[PDB]
Amino acid sequence: RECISIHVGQAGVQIGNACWELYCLEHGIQPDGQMPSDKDSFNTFFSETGAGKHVPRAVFVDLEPTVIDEVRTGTYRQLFHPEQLITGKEDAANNYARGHYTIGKEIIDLVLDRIRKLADQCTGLQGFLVFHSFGGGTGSGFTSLLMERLSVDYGKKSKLEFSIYPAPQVSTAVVEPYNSILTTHTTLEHSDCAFMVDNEAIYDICRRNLDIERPTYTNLNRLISQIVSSITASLRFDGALNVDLTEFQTNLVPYPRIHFPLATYAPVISAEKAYHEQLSVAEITNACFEPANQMVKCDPRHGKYMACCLLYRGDVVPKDVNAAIATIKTKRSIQFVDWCPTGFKVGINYQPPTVVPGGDLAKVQRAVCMLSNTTAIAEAWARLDHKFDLMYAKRAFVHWYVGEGMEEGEFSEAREDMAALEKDYEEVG
Amino acid sequence: DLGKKLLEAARAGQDDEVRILMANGADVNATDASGLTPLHLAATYGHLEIVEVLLKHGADVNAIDIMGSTPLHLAALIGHLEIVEVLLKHGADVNAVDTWGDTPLHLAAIMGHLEIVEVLLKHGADVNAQDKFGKTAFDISIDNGNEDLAEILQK
Amino acid sequence: MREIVHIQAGQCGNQIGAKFWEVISDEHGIDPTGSYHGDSDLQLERINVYYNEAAGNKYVPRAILVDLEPGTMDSVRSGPFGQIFRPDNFVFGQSGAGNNWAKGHYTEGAELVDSVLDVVRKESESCDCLQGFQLTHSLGGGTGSGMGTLLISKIREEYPDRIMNTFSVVPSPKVSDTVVEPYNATLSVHQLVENTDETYCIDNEALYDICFRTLKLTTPTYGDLNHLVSATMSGVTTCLRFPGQLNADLRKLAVNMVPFPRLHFFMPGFAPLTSRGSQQYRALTVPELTQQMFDAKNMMAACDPRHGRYLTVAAVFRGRMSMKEVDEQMLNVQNKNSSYFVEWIPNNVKTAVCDIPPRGLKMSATFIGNSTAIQELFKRISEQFTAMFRRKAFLHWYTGEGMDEMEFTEAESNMNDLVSEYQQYQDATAD
Ligand SMILES: Nc1nc2c(ncn2[C@@H]2O[C@H](COP(=O)(O)OP(=O)(O)OP(=O)(O)O)[C@@H](O)[C@H]2O)c(=O)[nH]1
Ligand SMILES: Nc1nc2c(ncn2[C@@H]2O[C@H](COP(=O)(O)OP(=O)(O)OP(=O)(O)O)[C@@H](O)[C@H]2O)c(=O)[nH]1
Ligand SMILES: COc1ccc(-c2oc3cc(O)cc(O)c3c(=O)c2OC)cc1O
Ligand SMILES: [Mg+2]
Ligand SMILES: [Mg+2]
């Protein structure tokens, strides 16, 4: 049962690069697609040609060519279907409206037809994993247009997002709060599960765990791809937890609108510490409840849990996981809502995690990604909504959107949806 | 009517035409529809020789049009330094006030005619004279950030 | 979003335009014949933004040269790079406009505008993905101001989804004591408020003041002034001409700098301020660069930023320097000067860094502010306009060209409305 990954805009494309590079290493696939090791569950993400070439089920889309041209000429110039690397000539100029209406309209049909080509090669297509920024005009506006069209053309298929949530340290546009709220409003009903990636959280982790004083996108993306990989490993390997996209929703999403789980990953160790003492199951599990290791800045102690999955990779004995969990349910004030099993779901993949040559992370014997649905992630929505409110009260910059095929009432409509979402979290909390 | 022709010759700078019309009885103090005299127009358009000849033949150096503008107002606004000098020598009121409350000092300051500002000050221009919004020439120089002008006005 | 079409109109427009092309040609390693003699590939990656590539690795400016006054033709050609421009891109009339906006906008200028539009169309049709136009002109004359704004409006009609950007030189009695210039500038600003997306306000009052009071040049020349202009024009286009993590193009600049369509007049600034042929052991630190960039003395418009509030700011550092040190200094200025940045536009100061410094400097910084203080520049022009208009001096020069006297009142009213709008957002609170 196949999964198709779609990467939209610069952030989505560059993060996709890092992910598929890691995927190839994890499955023993070379940059030209050849795989001696064997020739399996990795077929969910890789098709196979008659010549034994394993090709990602992946589409990359951008409204200008700069970043995708790098994929077309780089290490993996031969990995992807060349027709699944799709570029226009003029980007969305940081404007949701241009990505969704005026510029994105020119290429949406080509993108859907190229996706159809991949879908037609699947015998049991599960759905889509969609990578994109909140802040960009393409990442926000074209993604919501694409998600709208995918819901119509693939009504029964699941759609998962990995969404890059903006931070001022590395942001590019002052209007990123607008683009973030607009795409969240219009994509909410078309997405089943969305893992937000707070650039500020990733930036902080690079600074304090990896000793990188001024992290670049390359630093950020290698860490993000490690975490994405730990999230998608269950789809590409044998395992008992989160084995298809439907189960992501079953396990992590109790109601369709609050479908934003929090990812926490440990351990993150600088590659300069190649002889670090190895951390135990108990230590890496306890680290999953330290806010400093989260992919989104918020405080789960101020919220309630609705779900909690622990995805282990490496030298991890099940009895040690259970003892580590037992400790957590005692020493820790970890409050579940009253209507959810206060149980932790556990998957173990016994292969040790892979690290990419060129990366910043030390190899480790065991790692864990915790996926939890906590009401505390509403703090991230509140931070965005407040920045939206400051500018929108003056109608600052709104004329750029109204001039690009969008109506001013869509701003208020989107913001009311966000208010309802914040209230959704309060009522569960 | 030689008055309308004198008004036109003064504005256009036609010296000989001005001489001829005065020799045939043209009203040196004719006014156009707004009250401008030949001297106003020659002062506005920079015709120094016509200014002097008009002043030689009975021009009222301090005539006002309907907006209270004197010839010195207009010479100071447009920036004709030599004409400013001649008008003052012939008795021009250095502190004449027009309907907007402006003096010649106000107008030279606004337009950045710094040499004319200095001449007006030397002839007793009133640094405390306020326009209808309460502004003196010094206020204009401060509000404007014109440091050269403000220095000149503090002397 | 690659190519820019550059237009230069009138004497001022062609003079500062020529300097621009001299300066960025040198930055991109292009010589006066069009050959690339540089030793870095960063010089060529985005050369197409401003140059067409022709036969035999020769680069030709995408530049159109316009003037009603034929003598401007010859001045450009006699310049160092005068032979680099495409001869068919010279579009010139028989007689200048004599500082008459009406002649530039309505009579002589309107007779020549279609010939300019033909060359513009030719340059535009050969562009891969045209991003928009930049125009250099003065507002105090007749051609650059009157014909310049007519051109803008016409280009606007033909290319409605293309950005229009101007470098507009504002008049000052300190440089030209010609008293109709407030008329021409006010009529022009009326046009620019409606028809351009972004305008760099190059104020001859500020340029003179910098030269006379800071650089100690007792009698500044146009070359002294234009030395400051070309440093500024190079700095504000750096992010368009060299690859940058900021993805810079004219529309993104507009989206991030212009919160309200009419309030699109930028205050530029530059550090270090230098006189030409006057090298000094500069080696400005990053803290000196940051402080000078926000100093009123370094602004190319004669306005005190401390008298208003920054809606948006871009700061472009050029040279080899610590990114971290820049980040720390840039956060410092916002934390100390906190009250000078509007609180209702979060994260409204952007920093860019280009490794490549301008000619003759190891360190440099360029400032682009959308500051409500720019109302001081419009109020200065407005007061001179009003002083003249109330006595109706030289109005016949304009109405004699078919122009109506109500266009003067309308322009003055629109520019005063512009001032009121700046004051409105200067006093607005996030409450
Ligand atoms: N983590 C990460 N964030 C990125 C990357 N590239 C851009 N961003 C972030 O994404 C936001 C900007 O959106 P982009 O993805 O670059 O823009 P886009 O989707 O191409 O849309 P347009 O360029 O406006 O057409 C900002 O918040 C950036 O910080 C990246 O490679 N990694
Ligand atoms: N900074 C700077 N200003 C200039 C330059 N040349 C002219 N000016 C200013 O431009 C204004 C006059 O406009 P011009 O460009 O000379 O006139 P024009 O555009 O050719 O139009 P015409 O009236 O027909 O001559 C005055 O404010 C001058 O001070 C220059 O080279 N550099
Ligand atoms: C409020 O924060 C911001 C301020 C400015 C910018 C920005 O600055 C420029 C400066 C230039 O000199 C040239 C440019 O092309 C650009 C530009 O394209 C651009 O937007 C992509 C972005 C921001 O987010
Ligand atoms: Mg992009
Ligand atoms: Mg000229």
Which structural domain range is residue A399 located in?
A: 377-429
Q: C410 and C315: one domain?
A: no
Which structural domain range is residue C277 located in?
A: 260-373
**C258 close to ligand 3 (CB < 6 Angstrom):** no
Beta bridge mates, C91: C66
* Residue that is written with structure tokens 């000619």 in the block: C359
Give dist(CA B139, CA C310) in Å, integer: 26
Is residue C365 within 8 A of residue C330, CB to CB? The reply is no
Is residue C187 within 8 A of residue C156, CB to CB? The reply is no
Give dist(CA C364, CA C358) in Å, integer: 7
Q: Is A36 helix (H, G, I), strand (E, B) or coil?
A: coil
SS3 content of chain B, % helix, strand, coil (to 5): 55, 0, 45
Domain boundary among C259, C274, C305: C259
CATH number of the CATH domain containing A313: 3.30.1330.20
Q: A162 and A143: one domain?
A: yes
Min Cα separation C300/chain A (Å)? 24
Q: A65 and A100: one domain?
A: yes
Q: C420 and C335: one domain?
A: no
Q: Say if the Cβ atoms of B144 and C387 lie within 8 Å.
A: no
Q: Determine which of A64, A170, A174 to mutate to test the interface with C (most C C-beta atoms within 10 Å).
A: A174
Backbone angles phi, psi at A94, to 5 degrees: 65, 25
In angstroms, what is the span from residue C143 Cα to ligand 2's centroid? 9
Give dist(CA A108, CA A114) in Å, integer: 10
Q: A219 and A162: one domain?
A: yes
Is residue A5 within 8 A of residue A336, CB to CB? The reply is no
Q: A218 and A309: one domain?
A: no
**C268 close to ligand 2 (CB < 6 Angstrom):** no
Number of domains within chain A: 3
Kindly report the number of other CB atoms within 10 A of residue B124's CB atom. Answer: 10
Of C246, C346, C350, the CB nearest to A387: C346
Domain boundary among C226, C259, C292: C259
Give dist(CA A283, CA A263) in Å, integer: 17
Query: In this structure, which amino acid lies at residue B71?
Result: P
Give dist(CA A197, CA A163) in Å, integer: 6
Give dist(CA A252, CA A310) in Å, integer: 11
Is residue A88 part of an annotated ligand binding site?
A: no
Q: C217 and C362: one domain?
A: no
Give dist(CA A116, CA A114) in Å, integer: 5
Backbone angles phi, psi at C60, to 5 degrees: -120, 130
CATH number of the CATH domain containing A15: 3.40.50.1440
Kindly report the number of other CB atoms within 10 A of residue B12's CB atom. Answer: 15
Is residue A110 within 8 A of residue A86, CB to CB? The reply is yes
Kindly report the number of other CB atoms within 10 A of residue A155's CB atom. Answer: 7
Give dist(CA A63, CA A86) in Å, integer: 8
Side-chain half-sphere of B113: how many Cα atoms within 13 Å? 25
* C125: CB partners within 8 A, 6+ apart: none
* C112: CB partners within 8 A, 6+ apart: C66, C68, C91, C92, C93, C147
The 8-class DSSP code of residue A141 comes to I
CATH number of the CATH domain containing B37: 1.25.40.20
CA C304 → CA C199, C229, C294, C377, distances in Å?
18, 19, 10, 10
A177, A116, A106, A139: which is closest to A14 by C-alpha?
A139
Q: A27 and A171: one domain?
A: yes
SS3 of A85-108: EEECCCCCCCCHHHHHHHCHHHCH
Backbone angles phi, psi at A310, to 5 degrees: -115, 120
Q: A126 and A220: one domain?
A: yes
* C140: CB partners within 8 A, 6+ apart: C12, C99, C169, C170, C171, C176, C178, C181, C184, C185, C204
The 8-class DSSP code of residue C52 comes to E
C99, C237, C247: which is closest to C167 by C-alpha?
C237
Give dist(CA A14, CA A314) in Å, integer: 27
Helix H or strand E encompassing A176: helix A176-187
Number of domains within chain C: 3
* Residue that is written with structure tokens 């360029």 in the block: C366
The 8-class DSSP code of residue A294 comes to B
| Experimentally determined by | X-ray
List all residues of chain B from 7 to 66 with a beta carbon under 8 Å from chain C. Answer: 44
Q: Closest residue (by CA) to atom 7 of ligand 3?
A: C253
Give dist(CA C38, CA C84) in Å, integer: 17
> Per the structure block, which two tokens stand in for C231?
């440093």
Domain boundary among A331, A354, A376: A376
Number of domains within chain B: 1
Q: Is A267 helix (H, G, I), strand (E, B) or coil?
A: coil
A62, A183, A192: which is closest to A126 by C-alpha?
A192
Q: C32 and C60: one domain?
A: yes
> Per the structure block, which two tokens stand in for A9?
């805009």
Q: Longest C-alpha distance within chain C, in Å?
A: 62
Q: A365 and A391: one domain?
A: no
Q: A20 and A34: one domain?
A: yes
Q: A212 and A242: one domain?
A: yes
The answer to whether residue C387 neighbours chain B at the CB level (below 8 Å) is yes
Q: A226 and A181: one domain?
A: yes
Q: A420 and A347: one domain?
A: no
A169, A186, A168: which is closest to A177 by C-alpha?
A168
> Per the structure block, which two tokens stand in for C178?
């010609």
Give dist(CA B122, CA C347) in Å, integer: 54
> Per the structure block, which two tokens stand in for C227?
């030395």
Give dist(CA C131, CA C133) in Å, integer: 7
Give dist(CA A391, CA A411) in Å, integer: 11
Extract the runs of DSSP E, i.e. beta strands, from chain B.
Answer: none
Which structural domain range is residue B85 located in?
A: 1-155
Backbone angles phi, psi at B118, to 5 degrees: -60, -45
Ligand 1 pocket, residues with Cβ under 6 angstroms: A 9-11, 14-15, 62-63, 91-94, 133, 135-139, 164, 166, 170-172, 176, 199, 217, 220-221, 224; C 247
> Per the structure block, which two tokens stand in for C361?
């400097």
Q: A91 and A164: one domain?
A: yes
- Between vectors from CA A244 to CA A243 and to CA A245, what angle results, nearest 5°? 135
A303, A276, A309: which is closest to A291 by C-alpha?
A303
Radius of gyration (C-alpha) of chain B in whole angstroms? 16
Kindly report the number of other CB atoms within 10 A of residue A93's CB atom. Answer: 31
Q: Is the dihedral of CA C238, C241, C245, C251 positive or negative?
A: positive
A411, A392, A381, A388: which is closest to A198 by C-alpha?
A381
Domain boundary among C355, C373, C391: C373
A134, A146, A147, A136: which is closest to A95 by C-alpha?
A136
> Catalytic annotation on A277?
no
CA C177 → CA B38, B121, C242, distances in Å?
25, 20, 40
